């Protein structure tokens, strides 16, 4: 059975999400046209939130950066609109507890503005990147004697050499270097790697685990905020601590 209160709440939340996406899309179209008399702001803001929490709002310098994006559960009673779902599917983030690497540019920024309330965005350190790749590294490999490929752990440097040797990628250390420095064949290595399947910070429904869930929800509500302002900065959090908890 389905209750009318849940139906109405989902309708209202979906309507608000659609309105937010509409306003963001209009602002981005006017910014792209760049000849518009009427606009709110004409640049990009990054809000770094660290730890009783401190927030620093900075202008986006525009130089291409490296981000790690983790798909978290979205706002309550929201059915994901078509544009946000399309961007998430193109980023290969259709399910939660999944992370990918992203090359941050001026063209990438409006996509993050669209998909802000479903992801957490951070700057991965080298130790976190090495931990992610050497702990959870998987590829889709088609053997010579296998018709259909299956997903296996990134255990062979020979497979890396035979798949990305034309670009000049020999080993997993080379893949790490390419991802870290964002050089050539960065996209090739990034999509050679599968999206990373993390594990939940709190699992279980005993009394201790429910208390941990309550604390986690309180902390996430305190940290992450839903601006719904169509000019909001992109929130950047401590992805090192997040990956320590999730890996």
């Amino acid at each position: 059975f389905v209750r009318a209160e849940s139906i109405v709440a989902k309708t209202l939340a979906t309507s608000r999400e659609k309105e937010r996406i509409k306003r963001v899309s209009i602002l981005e179209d006017k910014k792209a046209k760049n000849e518009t008399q009427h606009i709110a702001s004409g640049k990009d803001f990054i809000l770094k939130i660290t730890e009783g929490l401190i927030r620093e709002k900075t202008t986006y310098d525009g130089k291409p950066a490296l981000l790690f994006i983790v798909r978290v559960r979205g706002p309550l009673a929201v059915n994901i609109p078509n544009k946000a779902f399309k961007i998430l599917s193109l980023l290969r983030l259709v399910e939660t507890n999944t992370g990918v690497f992203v090359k941050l540019t001026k063209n990438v920024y409006p996509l993050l503005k669209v998909i802000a309330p479903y992801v957490v965005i951070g700057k991965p350190s080298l130790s976190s990147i090495r931990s992610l790749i050497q702990k959870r590294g998987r590829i889709i490999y088609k053997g010579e004697n296998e018709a259909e490929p299956h997903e296996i752990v990134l255990n062979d440097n020979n497979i890396v050499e035979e798949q990305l040797g034309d670009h000049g990628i020999i080993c997993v250390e080379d893949i790490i270097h390419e991802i870290a420095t964002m050089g050539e064949s960065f996209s090739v290595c990034n999509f050679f790697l599968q999206p990373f399947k993390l594990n939940r910070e709190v699992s279980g429904f005993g009394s201790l685990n429910r208390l941990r869930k309550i604390k986690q929800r309180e902390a996430e509500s305190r940290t992450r905020q839903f601006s719904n302002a169509a000019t909001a900065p992109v929130i950047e959090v401590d992805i090192d601590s997040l990956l320590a908890k999730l890996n």
Binding site: S25, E28, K31, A32, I87, L90, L91, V102, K103, T105, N107, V108, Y109, P110, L111, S187, N190, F191
Partner: protein, 268 residues
């Protein structure tokens, strides 16, 4: 802009029109300016922000001084940020506006609108008792959902955006200066999507005809440069209009980054 003797005669005749011998005895004495424009003031997009026009003579101070003999007295509402509501009090405005006699009767934030005045009846009862509403320009963009649509059907209940922050921090000095400037020099006017603009000049009992003439001449001189206006009239409730201006030559105007981002984030 407007001939001085012409506007003086029009004002004298219209103020004579009231004194020939409920709300019938009180509403028929409010002076209105009509501006007829060739095109829409705003354009194809609706606007809720009130334009501010500066005049030589004070307007709200005569309103406060003449509200002493009215059923609904003159009141001021102040809406500030939820994070800056704690940094001020009634004394923090009294000690700076006691010289000018400007009294802020109520200070609220968005939390009060969201919790205490959430209900429609309570919100209407709270809003309708204020004559001048001022709000911080940061929170003024969320007010169409908080104060509701009934509050925007009148110029007196429509909020006025004021600059409260100096150097990106809450400056009580800038807040007080903007409050004083709004209360003394400037008046609001709602720009509609049509071609007729109605300006509430005030009440005949508030000010003398000389002050009315000076204020309306300054308003006309300021609004001539703003747009390509077409006609100007002066009227009162239950009375016809009187022309004051006419121009002709202004009439002759009557006759993918998103996909690039998707490509950059996609592999093929």
């Amino acid at each position: 802009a407007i001939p001085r003797e012409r506007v003086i005669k029009a004002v004298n005749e219209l103020i004579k029109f009231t004194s020939k011998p409920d709300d019938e005895e009180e509403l028929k004495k409010d002076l209105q300016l009509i501006v007829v424009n060739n095109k829409s003031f705003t354009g194809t997009s609706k606007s809720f922000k009130l334009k501010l026009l500066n005049v030589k003579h004070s307007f709200y101070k005569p309103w406060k001084e003449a509200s002493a003999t009215a059923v609904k007295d003159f009141k001021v509402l102040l809406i500030l940020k939820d994070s800056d509501i704690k940094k001020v009090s009634e004394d923090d405005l009294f000690d700076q506006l006691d010289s000018e006699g400007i009294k802020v009767d109520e200070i609220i934030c968005g939390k009060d609108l969201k919790t205490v005045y959430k209900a429609y009846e309570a919100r209407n009862a709270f809003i309708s008792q204020f004559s001048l509403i001022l709000a911080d320009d940061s929170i003024v963009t969320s007010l169409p959902k908080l104060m509701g649509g009934k509050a925007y059907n009148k110029v007196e209940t429509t909020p006025i955006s004021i600059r409260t922050h100096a150097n990106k921090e809450f400056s009580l000095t800038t807040l007080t200066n903007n409050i004083k400037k709004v209360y003394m020099n400037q008046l609001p006017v709602k720009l509609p999507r049509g071609t007729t603009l109605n300006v509430h000049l005030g009440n005949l009992e508030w000010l003398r005809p000389e002050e009315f003439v000076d204020n309306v001449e300054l308003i006309s001189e300021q609004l001539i440069k703003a747009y390509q206006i077409r006609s100007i009239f002066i009227k009162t409730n239950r009375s016809p209009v009187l022309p004051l201006y006419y121009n002709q030559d202004v009439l002759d105007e009557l006759e993918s980054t998103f996909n690039k981002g998707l490509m950059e984030i996609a592999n093929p």
